Design a binder for this molecule. Structure first.
Ligand SMILES: *[C@]1(C(=O)O)O[C@@H]([C@H](O)[C@H](O)CO)[C@H](NC(C)=O)[C@@H](O)[C@H]1F
Ligand SMILES: [Cl-]
Length: 624
C-alpha cells in the first residue's frame, strides 16, 4: 500500500454481522468470510457489494450477497443483504455478484445454486443452477439535517429464459458473471462479460447485454477461446475490451466493436501482458478493470495478484495504469506478503479507493483502502505521458513545418536520462539495463565485452508490457560507430534468445565498413557502406511477419524479408542496443546510440521520413 495511503478492515471476517432473514425472522448474524468485492459509486453514494459466506469460505456453502453503503466516502457505512439465496438447503447460495451502475440503480447479476457441493464447471448439467438479476435503487435524503441514503432491493428475476440451449458447435450448460463491476456502454446497453460452460465442461467468455434496462438480454454471437473464464470488460474508443482469466496461462484480452458478435485478440496492446504468477503456471484471478478520466486523460486501471506463493493464495495485489499504449506498474496495493486475490478499484470525486480481499487460513475479510499515494503516482506518470507527447507533437519538423512527429503507438523512449546501470524510459514504464556505458547528450556511448543496453521484452518476466512486439513494432535510433570492429558487431535489434545470438531482426556492422542487416536465421548479406564517426538514423520495422531495415530513411537493398518462419508466434527476449550487454558474447561494440523510440506498429513511409529529418530535435536533454 503506497505512502500516504491507508485502510480499514471493512467487512471483518468472523466479526461483522449482517441481517440474516429466514422464515420471516431477521437476525444479526456473524459472517465467517467476505469475498467477491465490488465497489461502485451510485450518484454519490459509495456501495460495496460482496459475498457473505456465513459458515465457511468454501465456495459451495451458504452465501447471501451483502451491501454496505456510505454517504461520507467511507467514513461510515450502513449494512444490508441485497440478495438472499433460495434457502433450499444448508449450502444454498447466490454467487459472484457482478454489478452495473446506471443512474441511481445497481444491477446485480448472481448465479444461484440450491444444493450442489461441487465446483460449477464440474457439473455435467444445470440441474442445480439459475442466473438471477436483482436491482437496487438508491435514494438520497436529509434526516436530522444530515445527508442520508437508502437502498431498496427488488426481488431477483431469473434470466434463464435468455440462455439458448445451443451455441455454435455446442450445448450450453451454465453461465455466471465475471464478478466485480461491469458497464453501461456508450449506447446505453447494460453489458456483462460472462463466463459460460458447455456440456463438455469447457469454459469460455461471451458478452451478455441488454438494450432495454434489463428487461431482456442477448448474447453476442462470438466468443473467447476455451479456457478464458471470469472476464472483466470496459469500453475504449468504441470497442469493448474484454480481459479474461486463464488458469495456468497468460491472460488473453480481446476487442469487440459489435457488442460481442466478433472477437479479436488484442495482440498489439494488452493480450498476454499479464501473467497469473511468476511462471504463469498457477491459477488466475478476478481483476478490476475500469476506464476512468484523470486530469482530462482517459485511461484504464487494472488489478491482479502476483501470486508468488502459488495455487490460489494470490499474494501481492498489484495496480496497473495504461493508455492502451504504455503500461505502468503503479505498485502493490496489498500489504507485505498477505494473500489478496479479488479486488475492486473505484475512482470517485478525484479520490481513488480499493476494496479487496485478505485471506489468512482461508478466512477472508475485505479491506477498504484509500489510495492516496497511488493516485499521486498515477497523476505524475500521466503528466509525464502528456508532456512528452505534447512536446514531440509540438516540434516544427523540417519542411513552414513538415508533418508532425508521430506519438501514436509510441510506447517507450530512451534518451538523455540514465543512472549508472539503467537507461531511463521517458514514459517511465520499462528502463533498459546497461553495461559499460558513458552518458552523452540524449543517449549512451558503449565499449568493451559485455557492453550495451538490454531493453527487456519477455525478460520483463511475469508481466510483459512489450508483448505486442511479437506481432508488430518499429524500433528507431541514431547511431555513430567509433571503431572498426574485428569481425561483425551488433548495433541494434530484437533478439529471440537471451544471448542475442538468435535474432528476429537486427543491424550489425563489420570490419569492411558494411552494414549487416539480419533477418531471422537467414544467411547474412553485408550491404551498403558506413564511415567511422558519422551519425546514421536506423529504423527496424516488423509487421505481417516481415522485417525491414532503414538507414537514413531509406531501406537497405534486399530488405523486406520474412523473419517469422513458421506460424509459431515469436517470443522476443529483448531489444539489444549498442552491443549485446552480455559478457558471454565476445563482441566489442564501440558506438554511441541516441534517442531510441519503440512503437507498437509498423510506421509508414511519411512517419519514418519525419523521424529521420527530425532526429536532432527530439531528445529530452533540455528538459531532464
Ligand atoms: C474465484 C477464485 O478463484 O477465488 O473463482 C471463481 C471461479 O472459479 C472463476 O470465476 C473461474 O470460473 C469462483 N466462482 C465460483 C462460482 O466458483 C469465485 O467464487 C472465487 F472463488
Ligand atoms: Cl457441448
Amino acid at each position: 500500500l503506497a505512502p500516504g495511503s491507508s485502510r480499514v478492515e471493512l467487512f471483518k471476517r468472523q466479526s461483522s454481522k449482517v441481517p440474516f432473514e429466514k422464515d420471516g425472522k431477521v437476525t444479526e448474524r456473524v459472517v465467517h468470510s467476505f469475498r467477491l468485492p465490488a465497489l461502485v459509486n451510485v450518484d454519490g453514494v459509495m456501495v460495496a457489494i460482496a459475498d457473505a459466506r456465513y459458515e465457511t469460505s468454501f465456495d459451495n456453502s451458504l452465501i447471501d450477497t451483502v451491501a454496505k453503503y456510505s454517504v461520507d466516502d467511507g467514513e461510515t457505512w450502513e449494512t444490508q443483504i441485497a440478495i438472499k439465496n433460495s434457502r433450499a438447503s444448508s449450502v444454498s447460495r447466490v454467487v459472484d455478484p457482478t454489478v452495473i451502475v446506471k443512474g441511481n440503480k445497481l444491477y446485480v447479476l448472481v448465479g444461484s445454486y440450491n444444493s450442489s457441493r461441487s465446483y460449477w464447471t464440474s457439473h455435467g448439467d444445470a440441474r442445480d443452477w439459475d442466473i438471477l438479476l436483482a436491482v437496487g435503487e438508491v435514494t438520497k435524503s436529509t434526516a436530522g439535517g444530515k445527508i442520508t441514503a437508502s437502498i431498496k432491493w427488488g426481488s431477483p428475476v431469473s434470466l434463464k429464459e435468455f440462455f439458448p440451449a445451443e451455441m455454435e458447435g455446442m450445448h450450453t450448460n451454465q453461465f455466471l458473471g465475471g464478478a466485480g463491476v461491469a458497464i453501461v456502454a456508450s449506447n446505453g446497453n447494460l453489458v456483462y462479460p460472462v463466463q459460460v460452460t458447455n456440456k463438455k465442461k469447457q469454459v469460455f467468455s461471451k458478452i451478455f447485454y441488454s438494450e432495454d434496462e434489463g428487461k431482456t438480454w442477448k448474447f453476442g454471437k462470438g466468443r473467447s477461446a476455451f479456457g478464458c473464464s471470469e472476464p472483466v470488460a470496459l469500453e475504449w474508443e468504441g470497442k469493448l475490451i474484454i480481459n479474461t482469466r486463464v488458469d495456468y496461462r497468460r491472460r488473453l484480452v480481446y476487442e469487440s466493436s459489435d457488442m460481442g458478435n466478433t472477437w479479436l485478440e488484442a495482440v498489439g496492446t494488452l493480450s498476454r501482458v499479464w501473467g497469473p504468477s511468476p511462471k504463469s503456471n498457477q491459477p488466475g484471478s478476478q481483476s478490476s478493470f475500469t476506464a476512468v478520466t484523470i486530469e482530462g486523460m482517459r485511461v484504464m486501471l487494472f488489478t491482479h495478484p502476483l501470486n508468488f506463493k502459488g495455487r490460489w493464495l494470490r499474494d501481492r495485489l498489484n495496480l496497473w495504469l495504461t493508455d492502451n499504449q504504455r503500461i505502468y506498474n503503479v505498485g502493490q496495493v496489498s500489504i507485505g506478503d498477505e494473500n489478496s486475490a479479488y479486488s475492486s478499484v473505484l475512482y470517485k470525486d478525484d479520490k481513488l479507493y480499493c476494496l479487496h480481499e485478505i485471506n489468512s487460513n482461508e478466512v477472508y475479510s475485505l479491506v477498504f483502502a484509500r489510495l492516496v499515494g497511488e493516485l499521486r503516482i498515477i497523476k505524475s506518470v500521466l503528466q509525464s505521458w502528456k508532456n512528452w507527447d505534447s512536446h514531440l507533437s509540438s516540434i516544427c519538423t523540417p519542411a513552414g513545418c513538415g508533418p508532425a512527429v508521430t506519438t501514436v503507438g509510441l510506447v517507450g523512449f530512451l534518451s538523455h536520462s540514465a543512472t549508472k546501470t539503467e537507461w531511463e524510459d521517458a514514459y517511465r514504464c520499462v528502463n533498459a539495463s546497461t553495461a559499460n556505458a558513458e552518458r552523452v547528450p540524449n543517449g549512451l556511448k558503449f565499449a568493451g565485452v559485455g557492453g550495451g543496453a538490454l531493453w527487456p521484452v519477455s525478460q520483463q518476466g511475469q508481466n510483459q508490457r512489450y508483448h505486442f512486439a511479437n506481432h508488430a513494432f518499429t524500433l528507431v535510433a541514431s547511431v555513430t560507430i567509433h571503431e572498426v570492429p574485428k569481425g561483425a558487431s551488433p548495433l541494434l535489434g530484437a533478439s529471440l534468445d537471451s544471448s542475442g545470438g538468435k535474432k528476429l531482426l537486427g543491424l550489425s556492422y563489420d570490419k569492411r565498413h558494411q552494414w549487416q542487416p539480419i533477418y531471422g536465421s537467414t544467411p547474412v548479406t553485408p550491404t551498403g557502406s558506413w564511415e567511422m564517426g558519422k551519425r546514421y538514423h536506423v529504423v527496424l520495422t516488423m509487421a505481417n511477419k516481415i522485417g525491414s531495415v532503414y538507414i537514413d530513411g531509406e531501406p537497405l537493398e534486399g530488405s523486406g524479408q520474412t523473419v517469422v518462419p513458421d506460424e509459431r508466434t515469436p517470443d522476443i527476449s529483448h531489444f539489444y542496443v549498442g552491443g549485446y550487454k552480455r559478457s558471454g558474447m565476445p563482441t566489442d561494440s564501440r558506438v554511441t546510440v541516441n534517442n531510441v523510440l519503440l512503437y507498437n506498429r509498423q510506421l509508414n513511409a511519411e512517419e519514418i521520413r519525419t523521424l529521420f529529418l527530425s532526429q536532432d530535435l527530439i531528445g529530452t536533454e533540455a528538459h531532464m
